[PDB]
Design a protein around this ligand. Structure first.
Ligand SMILES: Nc1ncnc2c1ncn2[C@@H]1O[C@H](COP(=O)(O)OP(=O)(O)NP(=O)(O)O)[C@@H](O)[C@H]1O
Ligand SMILES: Nc1ncnc2c1ncn2[C@@H]1O[C@H](COP(=O)(O)OP(=O)(O)NP(=O)(O)O)[C@@H](O)[C@H]1O
Ligand SMILES: O=C1CCCN[C@@H]1CCCn1cnc2cc(F)c(F)cc2c1=O
Ligand SMILES: O=C1CCCN[C@@H]1CCCn1cnc2cc(F)c(F)cc2c1=O
Ligand SMILES: [Cl-]
Ligand SMILES: [Mg+2]
Ligand SMILES: [Mg+2]
Ligand SMILES: [Mg+2]
Ligand SMILES: [Mg+2]
Lengths: 479, 477
């Protein structure tokens, strides 16, 4: 059972939620954690969703090696690279790196495979793990030294096509968070300071954690332009016979998405799992005490299960004899199962079951015949309700502002700011260092420049420099 | 085109088939290979099959870290372990190993999670890669330094329930090979010398490669007994409050299965992929050297076949003749080619050619979906049954040690009555090695579940002592 309160010590709440729900087991190698089945089933759901969707785009899965040779890799990231130096007691002739990301592993093959327009677009993805020796404080799911992800890497004849894929993938990430995990996200573009330096333009979806006021990057999708094509000699011949550079994209999203879901929907009793990604949508609990009707309770439970499955409802009967009914309520609650159905002798006689929804704790008396459609209705309710409350909290957490003098107070309130900005280079660093300084007495950075821009009245000035502002940019402390 | 003949230069045939089909891309780190979509799709297919099946048994997926501390890992195999000693320019406090297998990572967690009979059975699996710095020559799929696999590790209150699971998992590996890959395998028990030394009994599915006469272990399923439970202190209180040791199993199968399938079904033109796992089951080739008439029809045919869950691609590439395309998709092993030219358009028919035999069929458009489903089932089954007959043509039943070298020289396995005493296996290994020299060694592959009749008073082929069971032996991978 969870005892830390979400609104008091947040980090201790998160730790308790993930351990006691049996999502995570701690591990002796710092920054790495065991994903137990209750968390893994969720990853399988979002994984199957994203994967199905990219397959409709013609993206194919592959698998490239987890090792890259020193010299290929080495053609502020260097301190993060894990190096294999020995096999048994023998030193490798040359040390070898574990993949922090796969550009240096995939792009030489791309140069080889692409010869003409007939070879494009090339669209590949892989699901795998990557290793980065993160210097920031690690946190399960959100920042780990080994994490699971997919990375997609595509190559196109033209920028327009490449860019169209960038946005398509970004929309899939919106759907992963918003439609599967009921977590709202803001699409936007990274500032010049925050974008992937290997690319032309980096797009993102950004989420927000109210309890610590932290913005967090949810996924990423890069228009790479042609710089990688120039670096790796990825060229093709047009249908006219000339040699052209390819236009590339890459995109990735990780098990971080699970941590974001946990933090968003969790409460003081622990986990709350959105029905769309819950492996157990409805747990059925037989109420057994003093031998009253034991066999008839269990029988109708099996009957209800079969009925609910016809409607594609994912149902588990917890008929384990070595646990009390009250232990079961607690167990499945801390685990965040969206609906609990209880069946004792009193309920049995009536042709009804008592059903409790995990998000609000509301109980329903429902007749056996109304079950399938009532539960489907409740599950859409839960899913939509989880999302809309999270959305309202996201919007309560963002403050529209005009001047730097408004910044520090908004941060103390654990909010982000949407502020007009000239998008100058020195600016962001200045702002980072200064909010850094005022906080110590930490830093605030740009999260993104939202795609959805409020109007910009003529003559409005950059909130920091005083110069003419360009667009509204979202800022805050972040992960 | 593939030019090395499969029977005459098998090693070069293999390399040619996997590269020219675009399954595999070579790579600068030894024993590591890129798996391109044409190969990877097949992996997703067998993975989806095996995963769906173990989920029916209540096995649940998880992900344990790829790193294990030196202290945990070291609680024979030592030279194979890859060690990380630095991050960037900084030395670690102690070296950390990349997982060559996950026992030392999982079993301490199991010792914590298992306290009571009600925690049992515990049934976990993971899909991941493992790394082993193999000393033997690397071979794409069959023996790689990084490989993809699943490993299942379970714990039970009793040996009986553990053994039940061992056998159910082994039956699933038989299915993975025989049903998905159309590769016949032989269930068996490993000898004392060949079993996992950390377990009580190892079961296996064994396959045969006729072109080089070598047996190859296809997958493995172990009754671990209680020794890991002693080692890691995995105990539970039973119903009476008594501390008991759990009974364990583990099992694994790798991307090696893809290479076994390639070798089993390939021919001189290249790959033949069983319809149940092919990325493309039906390639539609328009006979063109556009107005929209032929392509238009190809799209309609595709749509109609996709309605029947047939995986289709139209090869509408501009720069290539039909004959070039035929060969291209043959080398890739697409089981069915659908040809559509002006004469076909004119007659409402399409010509279909199956990759395994080259038989051609004239089929009306209306009939395509049902006839192609039926051809795919016929191809899948016919691949299996021809490979099955080749497996059994590759095994010689013998009585005496003098029958051995002639059998091995015919690139055949041998089935012989064996007394199963510990020392004779090593002796047979050494003796067949030395005779070969005049990887030549003959070892046991498995003691098959399917035991041929054993006449009363039959002697061990080697020691002459009384013979227990028939054992299958051969050169192997
Ligand atoms: N260490 C990590 N653990 C888990 N998820 C991560 C980690 N690092 C990055 N991510 C997520 O993976 C996505 C793509 O990774 P990438 O864009 O390479 O990260 P990044 O540039 O290193 N971000 P950051 O580490 O904050 O500077 C990011 O948008 C994050 O959502
Ligand atoms: N290097 C490898 N590459 C690909 N598949 C492998 C490799 N090593 C083992 N396998 C397969 O994975 C299965 C389970 O692995 P395991 O039982 O640990 O192998 P093993 O005991 O090392 N066999 P061997 O290396 O021949 O002595 C084996 O039965 C093989 O089918
Ligand atoms: O963000 C993506 C999506 C997946 C493809 N890669 C891009 C950029 C990745 C940014 N990134 C992130 N982290 C890294 C860490 C390293 F150690 C390293 F060598 C490189 C990187 C690195 O390039
Ligand atoms: O048979 C399997 C597959 C599923 C569970 N794991 C076992 C492999 C155990 C045998 N084995 C096999 N190979 C190993 C290689 C190593 F480098 C190492 F450290 C350990 C091993 C090792 O234990
Ligand atoms: Cl070496
Ligand atoms: Mg980073
Ligand atoms: Mg950054
Ligand atoms: Mg080995
Ligand atoms: Mg061995």
């Amino acid at each position: 059972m969870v005892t830390a309160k979400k609104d008091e010590n947040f980090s201790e709440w998160y730790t308790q939620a993930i351990v006691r729900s049996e999502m995570i087991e701690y591990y002796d190698i710092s920054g790495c954690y065991i994903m137990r089945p209750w968390a893994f089933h969720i990853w399988e759901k979002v994984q199957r969703f994203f994967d199905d969707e990219i397959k409709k785009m013609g993206v194919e899965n592959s698998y490239f090696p987890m090792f890259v040779s020193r010299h290929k890799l080495e053609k502020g990231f260097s301190p993060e690279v894990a190096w294999v130096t020995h096999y048994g007691d023998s030193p490798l002739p040359e040390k070898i790196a574990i993949r922090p990301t796969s550009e240096t592993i995939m792009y030489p093959a791309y140069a080889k495979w692409i010869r003409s327009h007939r070879d494009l677009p090339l669209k590949l993805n892989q699901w795998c793990s990557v290793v980065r020796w993160e210097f920031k404080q690690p946190t399960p799911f959100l920042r780990t030294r080994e994490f699971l992800w997919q990375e997609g890497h595509t190559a196109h004849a033209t920028e327009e096509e490449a860019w169209e894929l960038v946005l398509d993938i970004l929309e899939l990430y919106r759907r992963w968070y918003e439609e599967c995990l009921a977590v709202p996200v803001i699409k936007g573009e990274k500032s010049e300071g925050e974008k992937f330096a290997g690319g032309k333009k980096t797009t993102t979806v950004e989420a927000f954690i109210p309890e610590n006021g932290r913005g967090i990057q949810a996924a990423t999708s890069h228009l790479l332009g042609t710089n990688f094509a120039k670096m790796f000699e990825i060229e093709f011949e047009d249908e006219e016979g000339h040699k052209r550079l390819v236009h590339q994209t890459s995109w990735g999203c990780t098990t971080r998405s699970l941590g974001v879901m946990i933090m968003t929907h969790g409460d003081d009793k622990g986990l709350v799992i959105p029905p769309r990604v819950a492996s157990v949508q409805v747990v059925i609990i037989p109420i057994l005490f003093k031998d009253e009707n034991t066999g008839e309770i269990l029988g109708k439970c099996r009957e209800l299960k079969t009925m609910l499955e016809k409607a594609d409802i994912r149902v588990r009967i917890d008929d384990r004899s070595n646990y009390t009914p009250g232990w079961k309520y607690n167990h499945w609650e801390v685990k965040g199962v969206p609906l609990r159905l209880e069946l004792g002798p009193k309920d049995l006689a009536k042709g009804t079951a008592r059903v409790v929804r995990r998000d609000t704790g509301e109980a329903y008396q429902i007749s056996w015949a109304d079950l399938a459609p009532k539960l489907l209705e409740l599950m859409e309710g839960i899913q939509r309700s989880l999302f809309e409350k999270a959305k309202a909290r996201l919007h309560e957490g963002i403050e529209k502002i005009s001047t730097f003098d408004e910044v520090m107070p908004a941060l103390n309130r654990k909010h982000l700011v949407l502020a007009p900005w000239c998008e100058d280079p020195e600016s962001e660093e200045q702002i980072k260092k200064e909010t850094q300084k005022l906080s110590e007495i930490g830093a605030m950075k740009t999260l993104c420049i939202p795609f959805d821009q409020p109007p910009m009245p003529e003559g409005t000035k950059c909130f920091y420099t005083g110069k003419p502002a360009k667009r509204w940019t979202l800022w805050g402390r972040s992960y």
